[PDB]
Amino acid sequence: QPAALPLFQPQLVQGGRPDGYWVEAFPFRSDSSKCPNIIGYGLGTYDMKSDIQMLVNPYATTNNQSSSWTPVPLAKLDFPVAMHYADITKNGFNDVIITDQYGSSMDDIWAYGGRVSWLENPGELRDNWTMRTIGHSPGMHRLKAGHFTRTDRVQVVAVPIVVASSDLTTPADVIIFTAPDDPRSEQLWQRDVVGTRHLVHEVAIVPAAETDGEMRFDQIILAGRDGVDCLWYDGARWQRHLVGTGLPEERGDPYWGAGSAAVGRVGDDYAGYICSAEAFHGNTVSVYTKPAGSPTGIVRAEWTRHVLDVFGPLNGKHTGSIHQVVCADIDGDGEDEFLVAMMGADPPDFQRTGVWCYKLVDRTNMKFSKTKVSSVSAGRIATANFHSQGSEVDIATISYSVPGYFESPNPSINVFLSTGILAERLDEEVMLRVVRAGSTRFKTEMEFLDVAGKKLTLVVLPPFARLDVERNVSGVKVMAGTVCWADENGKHERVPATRPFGCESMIVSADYLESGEEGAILVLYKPSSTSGRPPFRSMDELVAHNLFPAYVPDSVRAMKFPWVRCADRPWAHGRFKDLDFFNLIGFHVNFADDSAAVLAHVQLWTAGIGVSAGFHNHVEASFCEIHACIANGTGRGGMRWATVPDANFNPDSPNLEDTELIVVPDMHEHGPLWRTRPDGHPLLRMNDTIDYPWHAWLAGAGNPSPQAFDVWVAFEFPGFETFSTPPPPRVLEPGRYAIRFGDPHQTASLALQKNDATDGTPVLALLDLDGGPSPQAWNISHVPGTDMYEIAHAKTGSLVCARWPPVKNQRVAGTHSPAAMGLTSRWAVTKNTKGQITFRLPEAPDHGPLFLSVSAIDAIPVIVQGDSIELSAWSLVPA
Amino acid sequence: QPAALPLFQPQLVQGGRPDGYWVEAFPFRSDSSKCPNIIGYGLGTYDMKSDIQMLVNPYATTNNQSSSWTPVPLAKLDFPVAMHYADITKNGFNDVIITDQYGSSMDDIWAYGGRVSWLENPGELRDNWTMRTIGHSPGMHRLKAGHFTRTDRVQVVAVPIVVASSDLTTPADVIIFTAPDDPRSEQLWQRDVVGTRHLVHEVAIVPAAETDGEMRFDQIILAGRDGVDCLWYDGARWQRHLVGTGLPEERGDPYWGAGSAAVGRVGDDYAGYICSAEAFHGNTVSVYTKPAGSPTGIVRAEWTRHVLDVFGPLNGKHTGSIHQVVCADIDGDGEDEFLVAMMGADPPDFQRTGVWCYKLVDRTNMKFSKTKVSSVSAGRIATANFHSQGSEVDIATISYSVPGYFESPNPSINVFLSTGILAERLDEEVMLRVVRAGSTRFKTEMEFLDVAGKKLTLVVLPPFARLDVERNVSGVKVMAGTVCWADENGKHERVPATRPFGCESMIVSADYLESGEEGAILVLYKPSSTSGRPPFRSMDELVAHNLFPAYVPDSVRAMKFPWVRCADRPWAHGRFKDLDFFNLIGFHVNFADDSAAVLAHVQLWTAGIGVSAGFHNHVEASFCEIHACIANGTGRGGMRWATVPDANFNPDSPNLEDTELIVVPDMHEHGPLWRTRPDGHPLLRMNDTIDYPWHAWLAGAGNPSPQAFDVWVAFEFPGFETFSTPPPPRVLEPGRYAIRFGDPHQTASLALQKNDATDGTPVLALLDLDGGPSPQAWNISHVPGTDMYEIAHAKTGSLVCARWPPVKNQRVAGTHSPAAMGLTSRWAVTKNTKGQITFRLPEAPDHGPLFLSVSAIDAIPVIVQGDSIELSAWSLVPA
Ligand SMILES: [Mg+2]
């Protein structure tokens, strides 16, 4: 699975700003990177100093209720530009390093300005921090902290863009400032100039710790008129390595080379590529690549420039829309994507406003795709996990707005919170949009409802991911994919529906569970101490509480979920009067991708002692339902279904002798009660509804003194194939095999014609020969929630599929477009005494069995037929 | 149909404000109310004057591209409070009337302040308008313009809340200011005091023109410590009518009576009720009602107070969270809902923050329900149509934020735009959420895509609503409900699918069409001059343009919709290589209510000359598809379907002799090609997919020189019952009938037992007697898109339905919960020579026919049976 991008929940951090320029993820403490604060500000003007605002992260404090980011002004400065942070005082709190006194533009550089200073973090939320001067250089414009020549002091690389008003040709000093031993006294730091460069517009840092032992010290990557280059100190001296020269010079235009550059990790190499925007404020996005089998890192490789995109011509002043690039692992796959900060344009163009996310889609040819992730001005991007402890990467932006120069409407700071789940209000219910679990690399958890002693939580798990739980207490109900856990009785697996008429505990007996190869989506039932405890003697004891986290929309946070007597619902139509029978709604789970497909609808129910929810059969709306009992009032509450024909049972005055009872104890889920074919496909009524016998939840019988409510959850799935009737014996371990027909004397093996991945490619049996092209390998996997198997070509992934229609002598082909419910590409498996395997299609209620077969006893066409068992016995040989 | 509320698209008008208090819909011109500007401001502080900001409506200018509201400061004032507007200079531009110099609170009233002034609108967008003093009174706090004692000058009623610092017991003058003959000279207006009141906190105006001739002049409704009362001038004198006294006085608490009041239209009466918040800044919502058969209006009725809601206790200072009530017809049904402005609370409570919308649900008992429409602070609400010309009502709010008193986080101005359609990005496609057409009272239109010479537009129509079109040019394709138009050949009706294998023009030959009783949802194809003209000779000529209006989210506005060669789509899997066959995606239409149900998926396609889109049968995903051709390349392009068994046709090398061709000319749609039962229910495959014969779009044959593309739209619907095979004769006009069995000599008529609306109530035939309880009436209606009818009880709406299962001798009952696709409650109709009518259920492929019947030849049970024609012949008698 290539990784898909996560979703993003937008949130306005600060709107209505007079201007904007810089945004920075600022961790308040130097021992923690998670939920940092945001600092933002603009360039100011001659009429207004710029407030250096630290916006306090409301999510940082565990158990938070607020989504409001409180601004705390650290300073009020004339013409600030760039900033970074480091623990200067070495006391566990990050200090701010900032440049100011720049002037109002490149044509108005303060000759005595270009100051670099630091702001002492006082270890608590207070405004107006103590500020001390580090040094000065006119035009001072970018800076980063790090360890460049030593590791026992903070050091700062600082670089002016120009040296003087309107001077676009004189190079500027690249300066390293070194903290003194006591930075709270002294004043003016040690300074050393380590190079001169033209129009440097970005400084990027590669921390030594990123380089897996290649570098003792941090590398400085500069993007300016000279192109992109890397400076580093190696214990002995400074060296330089040219990455490339960027945009060629154009006559009458003072900007060439690069405007920004960032270093992109691919797998094991922190520098698998280097991306760049060109030139100063330009419209060109390029990437630098090195040849296959290069050393890791930057300085040992030869780089080559490739232009990816030109977003349009420059204006009269030779500028465009791109302000910055940054690299970050947005989709969690171990490769950095890169983000491009698009300021906006005049005339307005959405293509040049917001953030583009570029993704390396082919490591071999170094091909990238791009996806728009925001369409409001970004003059700068900050990345961090702003909302949780996980390895997700959120994106913060600030609009680019400089009054009387280039102003964006409504300048604002925004944050886009990476998530596998977005919540939105319908009317009385919530739509929960989820990523496909198979292609996400992040765990997402969202608590939604505190009810009946549990915090019901929606949980998206990537493939083979772990979820820690409270052993013997936490419960799970899977809605897509699979999870499993192990205990002394071996492996336990859970899927959307257990076996027909079956019952399974939802309780996890282990300390953790893991998703299988497709990931999982599930409801996790955490224990709660804030929604009552059983026995529930009244609906008052069962009041439910909205648990949505503070970053979900306000309209969802404000929702209540009352229990409503079923008599009072708009669908009662005069029924259920005077019954202790209650309903709580409700939650749709749909895929967030372009299918928008339903996953499940979820609602809750209760029934007092002696109460029946009423016999029904779902002729009104089609779905496959599973119930999970949270609390069983008497121990005897559960599902009954009629075992007689529909015509022979009266749901209004039920004869309970013509029913069977499946008791559903506390924290158990029951299996399907709908009608199925022998291989698990659902029977269907003439109006396209899943066919059910008459059935109902009924509480244990007796007198409600004292009262004790059943509480249960309905999961309404779209139609799917479930398990088989009767259950077949297990005879085949999934794995990778050659699939052979014939005697020890001369075999043919199953083959996809020419290994061709094209839909419709014939499947054949190739004579195995000494000349000896060897057998094609097939992956055989169990289809979860069924007793069926699929056969997928190991090289191309093509599924073994009968062509339509599945009839005697029908041809077999490879496909990635199977029929729904895998009708012609799923197989019932049996083993004879010779230990050969037969694969049989789902049997049409019409016809006889049809087996995967050879067409005769150099290539033999492969077919389905059920006349001859001889032609459909295969040997499986591990490959 | 009760009316449902519309959806609301939120938009931030202005964020990051220092404070907030007032928001007002401000029409710039006095001859137009649509798309007004917004004025907002807060109380200011001693440290900052308050900017009186007029935020320019970007949607006001037809052909707009921007969603940005430009602020224009009209004035900068010390401590402004209330404002309104009127055409003072009588020149066609509204002037602003404003109070200021109030002071900083009720404990700090400026003794020489309480100024009332007006700002002269200069007829263009300029800041800082000329300001002139009208008059003064300390504590001045609310004001409205109108015509109170004359109609030839602007008049202003102005009322202080207190007269002096901390004085909560002295009553204040109720003052009327009258414009001079030349308001641009003179200065200080004529003033008359027309009453004194305690703690007036709201002034509401009933315009004379609203009163259908009851009042010559405007009525002034005041809400204060004295309760709610109405003052008016009648040509002769001022009078007063008490509405009620509001919240009783409580010991130690200075606030009682009312904080706000608004007058609510119900149908023909501009004052069917009066709503109120109590007391000053309180938490109590009450309504005033008058008895059935009262005169219309206010002063002739006796009113009675009813408390609806108390949102919680007051704080230490005796205040709560409600600042204002307003009445407006939010759902367009001719009755005013009311809105309640909830400022917020400390500690925070979502229940007391935002806007609640109260709806009168029972005119008889005057019962209201409430629905949360915003959950961010509203210190004031303005209503208007901010986005179009229609009678929709949008809501603008400003947060209540007074520094050092009660401050809301991120004070902002927001607007909630009333709509039947919300658009949201999925990934490459757009989700269009729509209201149910049956319960909306608004037309909504949203352009989405400019392609192939048409502006494709999504259109929601309420029941019996009109849509003007360009005769013989505009095209429509219905996705839900029905529309029709008339021309010289009579009525034409369109529904989601015409007859199986049929073809109909989409072109409207009339100047308008109308929706039927369920409303409609449709795609309107407007003519375009900005997306090319046929013949389309290349895909370049077919570039499509995003048309979403400026108020939809930026992420949807920024989307492009490229044509992609089908070979290049991720679902091709190696197919369609080197074909001129292209695909454009795409648009989901789903219901916005708690069902979230699919309506249709929409995508587009093209095929060059001689190109086949390939034979297929939809075993992969289930849906009922209809295609509409926009442009037919050769005139011969269209749908072929195989007329032989699935097993007998090779989609890879098709024999076109075993197919039939339906040519689909320009702007035509074809009918269903899927397999159906005789009464229109879809055949279903074992994997729950709609069963289709092999079928494909194929372009006209020949050589692409010169090229000419087919362009067509796919509409993928969920499963539904279509028309019958063969089509039955039309023998019954829908309408209201008594349904009788038997001889002229002695009949029984169809009856719902005891007229009982309960699901499952028996249907019977009651002996018609001289003693003479007369026959129950039934509404018989055609089911659109089918040849079936339904029978609904005229009093209760209950559908005539066979109980499950429909078998010989099965009982018949009334229901509001029919089986999907109306399986047991829809009827095929035939007429014998005696002119009697027989009603037959959809026939199960199993059983024989089953007719609505009497069970014998005082009440006879009614059943379904098909053994005896005798028992199932009915006379229909108009009722
Ligand atoms: Mg420190």
Ligand SMILES: [Mg+2]
């Ligand atoms: Mg005027």
Ligand SMILES: [Zn+2]
């Ligand atoms: Zn810049």
Ligand SMILES: [Zn+2]
């Ligand atoms: Zn990545």
Ligand SMILES: [Zn+2]
């Ligand atoms: Zn059920």
Ligand SMILES: [Zn+2]
């Ligand atoms: Zn107030």
Ligand SMILES: [Zn+2]
């Ligand atoms: Zn209304």
Ligand SMILES: [Zn+2]
């Ligand atoms: Zn088709």
